[PDB]
Amino acid sequence: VKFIEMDIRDKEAYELAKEWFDEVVVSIKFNEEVDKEKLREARKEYGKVAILLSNPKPSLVRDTVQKFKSYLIYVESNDLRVIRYSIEKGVDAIISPWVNRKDPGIDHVLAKLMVKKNVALGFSLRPLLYSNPYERANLLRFMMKAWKLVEKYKVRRFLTSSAQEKWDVRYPRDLISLGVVIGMEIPQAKASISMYPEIILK
DSSP: OOEEEEEOOOOOHHHHHHHHHHHEEEEESSOOOOOHHHHHHHHHHHSSSEEEEESSHHHHHHHHHHHSSEEEEEEEEEEEEEEEEEEEHOEEOOOOOOTSSSSOOOHHHHHHHHHHTOOOOEEESSHHHHSOOOHHHHHHHHHHHHHHHHHHHTTOEEEEOOOGGGGGOOOOOHHHHHHHHTTOOHHHHTTTTTHHHHHHHH
């Protein structure tokens, strides 16, 4: 089986993940404008790079999906309006929408739209690692609820470290264990780091 890490956000984490996965995608964060040159080099260098829009305005999302068609586009936002809109615009993935929210960041209506628009939901490990015991428990609760919805409607999904440091990276074995903890069966967790990433990449 070919395991894939869809979201690495640090150079040293990338080098380590490359030793453990068949393919690693590096996410380049942008908040106001997407820089073609900053991306261009990443492609030649890393090969596979995703544009990560962090708390973007709707206009930024629209522009990006139009201009950069050959790039994967991920959206991280805690604004339900932006999340819904990004899904409608057909971005490739919504990453951990429950972060900085008091709910899963996804519901029945949104899950249905995600499947229709072929948008994936990315489950990040990082938040759990950086949180204290109490915060971790709340995050897990929201992640579990998000998983049940994703499973119920067959929404594409993937597990990822979303690593910012070398020590945030995890071997497939341990990402699978994360999947089980949030409620996935072993095969589902395995598919979340192989089959689904393959479908998302095409």
